Design a protein around this ligand. Structure first.
Ligand SMILES: Cc1sc2c(c1C)C(c1ccc(Cl)cc1)=N[C@@H](CC(=O)NCCCCCCCCCCNC(=O)C[C@@H]1N=C(c3ccc(Cl)cc3)c3c(sc(C)c3C)-n3c(C)nnc31)c1nnc(C)n1-2
Lengths: 131, 131
């Protein structure tokens, strides 16, 4: 069965906005979201609809771009690294559950390569921006 | 790279009609299939653009899906139940034509088709017109 989706807010988690996080939403997320291979990653894995009864036994930290997008929009993150970590979790979850050469893995790899290209242009200094 | 217009779901020039088994196909068959775990790929037309399938509509010239069937039933588009049963069969057949025997989507379609056959075996025995 599917767990609830990852939180996109938390009253106990400090919120923040930075120049780097703005970039992650406006440039990085936007570019990946519109990519040909984006669709399977735009919402949580539905293990019932995909008949993957072991998915959430193997994947203990699920993540998807819909969640990341909403976290950025909601100022859920404290810094850019927290967001970058979520992207990395999304990619590695796919590699962990699946096998090399699988179509979905090839898709994840292409998105990850694009991701790395785009964050190479991340502003080098973190500047906090008042919400 | 481009999707075709969806199948027709209503037409003034067409004689609108309703029967008891057509009502059953909507209220029982369509309803039950829609809620199946593997209904999702069949709930709307195949989106060849999103799925990157430039050959899908080269191969499939009579596409059909449950979203279209739902609309046809609602709009009283069919003349009788056999016209509707034919659309379900076309939907399944398209999947088996485009994909390979061991493919995940084919296994999904086969499970959905098994349920379809079970439900239509309980169709009202005599087709009677409803005004
Ligand atoms: C909305 C529709 S309509 C429709 C389709 C879809 C998605 C499908 C289809 C439907 C369901 C599935 Cl499981 C696979 C394909 N195939 C096309 C034909 C097609 O696209 N052929 C191209 C080759 C497809 C190769 C499919 C390999 C399937 C492997 C299944 C086992 N592995 C998994 O379930 C892991 C899962 N794997 C996938 C995945 C695998 C391959 C591809 Cl190309 C995309 C996503 C996946 C997600 S989330 C999510 C919503 C999906 C479909 N994912 C993430 C994230 N991480 N792992 C995954 C088709 N033909 N007739 C109909 C109807 N369809």
């Amino acid at each position: 069965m599917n767990p609830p989706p990852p939180e996109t807010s938390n009253p106990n988690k400090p919120k923040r906005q930075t120049n780097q996080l703005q970039y992650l939403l406006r440039v990085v997320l936007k570019t990946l979201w519109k990519h040909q291979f984006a669709w399977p990653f735009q919402q949580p894995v539905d293990a019932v609809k995909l008949n993957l009864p072991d998915y959430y036994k193997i994947i203990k930290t699920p993540m998807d771009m819909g969640t990341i997008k909403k976290r950025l929009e909601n100022n859920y993150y404290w810094n850019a690294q927290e967001c970058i970590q979520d992207f990395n979790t999304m990619f590695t979850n796919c590699y962990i559950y699946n096998k090399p050469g699988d179509d979905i893995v090839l898709m994840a790899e292409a998105l990850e390569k694009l991701f790395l290209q785009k964050i190479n242009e991340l502003p080098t200094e973190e500047t906090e921006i008042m919400i």
